[model samples]
Target: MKIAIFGTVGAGKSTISAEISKKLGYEIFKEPVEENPYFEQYYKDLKKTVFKMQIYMLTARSKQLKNIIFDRTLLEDPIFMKVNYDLNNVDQTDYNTYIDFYNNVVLENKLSFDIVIYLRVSTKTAISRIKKRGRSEELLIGEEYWETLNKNYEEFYKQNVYDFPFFVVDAELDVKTQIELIMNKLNSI
Candidate 1:
């Protein structure tokens, strides 16, 4: 019963994923925050480090995807890269490279999830939660960045919903309520 919790930063993906893993007795493959060497650099100067950061993330995710339920997906990288590219934070060449790699590595590999749970939150809410969490690298992230990522995530989901078993949860809900809703959906399916 492979599952992935998908959302933008501070959308409660980690929190919800952890709960789900505990309830289901599934191994939790968390997002590699502390292990990511490029995270600090990427946050400091997105243009210079976006490609490296994404590549590092994809490589790490690829190694974990087959082994355990994930808090996030490597498939979300292009959506995020699009936001960066629109802001000219990633060059055309790098964007093209990312697309090609993503296609070959992700699409060709055909990674599939039994269930994809999207935690939907407004940009303002996401930013507020991020501030509340108070991760140093995330403190500098602006609302505009989250807005773009949130938009991109919605667009991606719209395009790909039929590609997998999909579910959406309001991130603004209380954790227990959200978990109940998720578990209910899982049982129904």
Candidate 2:
């Protein structure tokens, strides 16, 4: 069964995705990071590189969706785009183009997951974890951005997440506890 873990930056997506994949003996498709040349630059100046970063991520993710549990969903593109648009980091024209590409390319070739697990964390916790992780680029990401992402995720979950089978885990829990909770839920379903 394909499963995708959804959450904001430093929300333990990688940890949970890896653990679940191990427990299920499923291949894991971790989110692309270092390979994307634009990733670090985009974090430094989102307004100038948001489009490139999103496109890079979308293409990379779409190609990896087959036969593996993913760390994030292609559906997350619009959530990030919305945050960029709100901040005037992405203009309407680019936003429109992104929507078009997502609909025609990303969604058209989509590999729907059997289940999605959202690791929900407070904005403060997300920021703290970001700092703890200490990625140079991510160190520049601020509380405001995390807050916006948190809000965007909440809005998206309320309106669009019901289309899939999913559950949310309180990420404040220890890793083992969270994994157990997820395993229990998965078995029940």
Candidate 3:
């Protein structure tokens, strides 16, 4: 089964993704970070890396393990790009182009997922974790940007998340407890 973990920035997507993949004995593909030469710079300057950079990175890592798991994937891209557009990092033309590409690509091809886990956290919690993580790259991101991302994720989940079973869990708990909840949900499903 294919699995993907969804969360806003610093919401512990990678941690949850790894634990779930381990439990299922699945190969995992973590989200791209340093792999992108411009990753750090992207955070410092979203205008340069707004739509085009995001779209490119989404494409780069989104081919998927196809039958395993990912820390994040193209599914998370629309929410992000939408937030960027709202923040005026992406202009109308670029936003339209991004949407068109998403429709023609992700939707048209129908990215498959057997199950998904959403690590829902408060925007404040997200910021706290980002600060705790101590990555200078992430530190460069504005608090308001993080807030916008969490907001967009909630909005996307309400409207756009479907096509597969989902296990939504609060991420305020420890990873062990969260994983237990996930497994319980799996059993019920």
C-alpha local distance difference test of each model: 0.84, 0.84, 0.79
Taking the tens digit of each residue's C-alpha lDDT, what string does model 1 give over 10-95?
89998898898888888887766878888776787887888888787777877775535778887786788899998889889989
* Candidate 1 TM-score versus the reference: 0.93
Candidate 1 clash pair list: none
Model 1: lDDT to the true structure? 0.84
- Using lDDT as the measure, name the better of candidate 1 and candidate 3: 1
Error at 54, model 1, angstroms: 1.0
The candidate 3 region of ten consecutive residues with least summed lDDT is: 58-67
Q: Tens digit of lDDT per residue, candidate 2, span 27-93?
A: 8777667777897688889988999988887888777665467787887778999899988899999
Model 2 misplacement above 4 A: none
What is candidate 3's lDDT per residue for 26-45, written digit by digit as tens? Answer: 78877567677777678888
How high is each candidate's TM-score? Answer: 0.93, 0.94, 0.90
- Model 2 Cα shift for residue 138 (angstroms): 0.9
Worst 10 residues of 2 by lDDT: 61-70
Error of 1 at 174 (Å): 0.8
